[PDB]
Structure 1
């Protein structure tokens, strides 16, 4: 049987385009996500391909990807989930994000110390902007998501 995570269950409203979600059973989605490993190590199985993951790993996941994770030792990761069709800003999302419209040709990247530092700073702010009661929080969140996406594009390597 399939397990498909639903944006209806993972986003605060129909307007919210991005959220910070943070083992995990095998699943697919109807939204996309960026995965960053903050520390420890473990296993990420993406479309039946196993990756031994560790601090600095970055994955670009499309909705139709099926994946699971397992912590081997002290795994800490973060998933930044987003709905491509909900984004309003005129950044070239598809040009900056593998996995935007279909499975990424190269889903797996790494980040150096500076990229991790800048991602950390942006993601921490993005976590605070989840409130659906604070006026225009969704727009603030999208600007932060834009910064993260550009920073990832700037710092990522294979």
Structure 2
């Protein structure tokens, strides 16, 4: 079980970006935080709650804290985890309405994004990566606004 104390920059940081360039084989685990997974390139086997997914560029996964998942049989798998703590979000967006897997396992954890969706996600995530400093005034609020933009754009662009 991965702990937010080990993955977030402080107790008040609500969102962070964990780059996996590449994602190597990773053991079955749960979390005490949630995460969005976006696959940028390569492929691999994502096993989510005992269900195997052959994942590839354009795949989007919504993961809840209590989901157990792993990565195996990877091939230059390039992804990003956008990790977040629901209880730390302050903005009044309807997070639960826009994020499958916000309060429990997603009904549908797996989605896809087209070129436009990936372009917008790339742009927002790049800015979000830059807002990680816990010393720059209100960087955490700026990061939450960008996470909000990412969440809306994913809802706008995603498909089954």
Q: What CA deviation, in whole Å up to 9, does each residue of 1:42-71 have, x standing for no partner? A: 110000000000000000000000000125
Distance 1:70 1:149 in 2: 27
**Equivalent residues of 2:25, 2:74 under 8 A apart:** no
Q: CA RMSD in A?
A: 1.2
**TM-score, normalization by structure 1:** 0.96
Greater than 3 Å deviation, 4+ residue runs:
none
Q: How many correspondences in the alignment? A: 155
Match in the other structure for 2:4:
7
Change in CA separation of 1:87 and 1:100 when aligned onto 2, cut-off 3 Å: same
Deviations 1:78-121 (CA, angstroms, capped at 9, x unpaired):
10000000000000000000000000000000000000000000
Of 19, 25, 28, 2:27 maps to 25
Q: 2: CA distance between counterparts of 1:9 and 1:72? A: 25
Partner deviation per Cα, 1:17-39 (whole Å, 9 max, x = no partner): 00001922110000000000000
TM-score (norm 2): 0.95
Paired position in structure 1 for 2:69: 67
